[PDB]
Design a protein around this ligand. Structure first.
Ligand code: HEM
Ligand code: HEM
Lengths: 375, 375
């Protein structure tokens, strides 16, 4: 039964990273209003409490005294089903400024996101002290979580930016067995590293003790977020041949061009002029598939978005790109540097997002998010 | 299983009016680019063809030569499942201007929406020559339909404004049996007239021969749409007693204040002074429940929406209000007139929408949307 699905909240790592993608999600960044490290700890403790309750489900908080605001928004009714909810907390570069004495604690590669050559960043949609990635089976559960978090933090958190996204229900319900199709009509996720292989994930996604990082970071992950708008109508009137040449993949099957099966692996060595798969194609640049490029593997966990219209009255739709990696410089920064100038660029418009560090897991009810960071 | 569900497209009435609410929907208004009535008829025939196909589902059309833009967006894959899709077409006041010589044919009560006292109308989110209400089990189906429609009308339609909405998955699944909860946390739909009652619908919703209307409108219905933004955070810190006094209903049970069941009928006659349910409460203003006021009954079919963050840092969430009635003046205009200045206004803010006339049904494949209107 879908509404009763739960992902464990406690663990060595946060959920929402390796977790198979649920159908609905939200990215919401906040300014932190805490004035002391003390206030910050109270906030982190409070958040852990709210996330623990929401993700595992229970009866909605009641309001015995009606002269008070309702203790729950009510939008789910009387029972708060877990509905496969995960909440992942990450912290931005700006949390490590003067306010809370955490500067010495900053992850070695964490930085403020700065624009790439194809960027049109909107200042209202960038950065933040903290980001929550909130995913569940249904949008109702995600919004209810947000409203709960907000009601509990008037003194501590102020919403900075928010965007909601989705993947198809049936792809979500296959728990990774079927690749989601993005709003350009291409399968998106095919070449992701196996999130179930724990040794691969220890190398690819998680910060490990062997890295040159502050101790508290161990078991967390660097997180790059990009809000990317599509030129939908322009894309839809583009020849199929060109769409495929831009990506490097067959639209229908998802296979690398020239091959038969979605998950087949291209051989770039036997195609040095890119007659088969173009040298400026998205996948060839994202992953050159050389011995040296293997250090730039990442776990992508992106969602589609659809809003209203743009300022030109064209459809506002795109990608909430999210990726996790053991090292921000070796992962996202390296890959995007390779992607600069790719054929796709004229079709997409990065307008927002930022870089964050996803905290390590919370061990149990006596622990709280950020405990190692704050001590 | 849900993907395979179909709603009939052909009928005396259009689907999507009496149809039980699906989980996902979109309102999309267009400017019509047709220059002639001849072009107008070409568009209407074209739309009928796209709607007939999309609602019943089938193989996605293939692209015979990759030099051609894809014949389908591909966002659903190789098969276009019906997924309970309905598409309802309505025409705005502006369609009856000098372009197509339809002035003599205009429904007596059709008019350009003008602001009510509490409105902050955004010009870009108002009016339109035509409006499509596109509803389905899932958002992917709805977006796919839109892209298909757009693909086939480059010379004929321009998107004017668009908003997508939802009701909860489970309320949606009970197919009308359980009332959707809106984003203020109140059950929303309780007092709707019974859409399965044919004689009642003929009275309340459908235009009938007796009305002083052009013959073509028979079997159509006046449609009022309001895009309404909620001050969600402010609402959430408002005492529950106050939330309830504003509506006239118990938030938890949805019953009229002082009664037991959600669907109990208030006895206003026994409370002439409004000590139980306030005289200026939402429901009592909306429906005085006198035999006289029955001319103002309507069928509401509204959806929640959730977008981003306003420039003042508040969540942009609210209601896509849609209602159907035999007479726009007797229904919505009369009801909103009673509502003007209600206490709810301090929590809500109309910003867009419009008045339209939903056309009569299409009889079979030999008929087309708006055939009576265009003859
Ligand atoms: C701009 C909008 C984007 C779209 C529409 C898009 C779509 C796709 C598609 C269709 C694929 C092929 C299927 C797959 O292997 O998942 C792909 C692969 C990939 N993408 Fe993107 N992507 C976008 C942005 C990005 C960004 C910003 C990055 C990293 C900075 C990125 C990194 C990757 C990587 C590493 C692969 C796997 C390539 C391989 O190993 O063969 N993508 N993307
Ligand atoms: C502005 C945001 C609005 C919200 C949050 C809202 C919500 C509600 C709620 C919770 C109810 C009680 C349950 C029910 O019977 O459905 C209700 C009833 C009703 N509403 Fe509203 N509504 C809004 C706007 C409107 C507008 C603009 C109209 C028409 C102009 C309208 C017309 C009605 C009617 C006719 C009823 C049934 C009352 C009865 O028969 O007892 N509502 N609404």
């Amino acid at each position: 039964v879908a509404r009763n699905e739960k992902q464990p909240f406690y663990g060595e790592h946060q959920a929402g990273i390796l977790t198979p993608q649920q159908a609905a999600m939200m990215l919401v960044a906040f300014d932190v209003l805490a004035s002391d490290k003390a206030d910050l700890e109270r906030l982190f403790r409070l958040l852990t409490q709210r996330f623990a309750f929401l993700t595992q489900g229970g009866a909605a908080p009641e309001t015995p005294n009606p002269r008070l605001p309702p203790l729950d928004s009510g939008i789910l009714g009387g029972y708060i089903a877990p509905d496969n909810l995960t909440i992942t907390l990450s912290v931005g570069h700006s949390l490590f400024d003067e306010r809370f004495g955490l500067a010495p604690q900053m992850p070695k590669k964490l930085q403020k996101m700065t624009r790439f050559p194809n960027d049109s960043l909107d200042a209202a949609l960038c950065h933040g002290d903290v980001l929550l990635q909130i995913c569940a089976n249904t949008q109702d559960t995600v919004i209810h979580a947000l409203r709960d978090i907000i009601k509990h933090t008037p003194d501590l958190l102020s919403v900075r930016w928010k965007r909601e996204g989705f993947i198809s229900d049936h792809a979500a319900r296959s728990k990774g067995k079927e690749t989601p199709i993005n709003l350009l009509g291409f399968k998106d996720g095919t070449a992701n590293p196996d999130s179930q292989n724990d040794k691969l994930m220890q190398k690819v996604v998680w910060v490990t003790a062997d890295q040159q990082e502050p101790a508290w970071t161990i078991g967390g992950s660097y997180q790059a977020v990009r809000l990317i708008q599509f030129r939908v109508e322009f894309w839809d009137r583009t020849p199929l041949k060109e769409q495929q040449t831009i990506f490097g993949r067959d639209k229908q099957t998802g296979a690398p061009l020239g091959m038969q099966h979605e998950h087949d692996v291209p051989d770039y060595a036997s195609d040095p002029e890119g007659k088969g798969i173009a040298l400026d194609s998205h996948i060839r640049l994202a992953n050159p598939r050389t011995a040296e490029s293997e250090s730039s593997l990442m776990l992508r966990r992106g969602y589609s978005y659809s809003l209203g219209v743009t300022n030109s009255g064209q459809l506002d739709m795109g990608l909430l790109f999210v990726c996790y990696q053991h090292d921000l410089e070796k992962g996202f920064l390296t890959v995007q540097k390779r992607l600069n100038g790719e054929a796709l660029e004229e079709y997409v418009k990065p307008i927002g997002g930022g870089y964050f560090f996803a905290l390590p897991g919370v061990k149990d009810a006596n622990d709280y998010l950020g405990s190692a960071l704050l001590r």
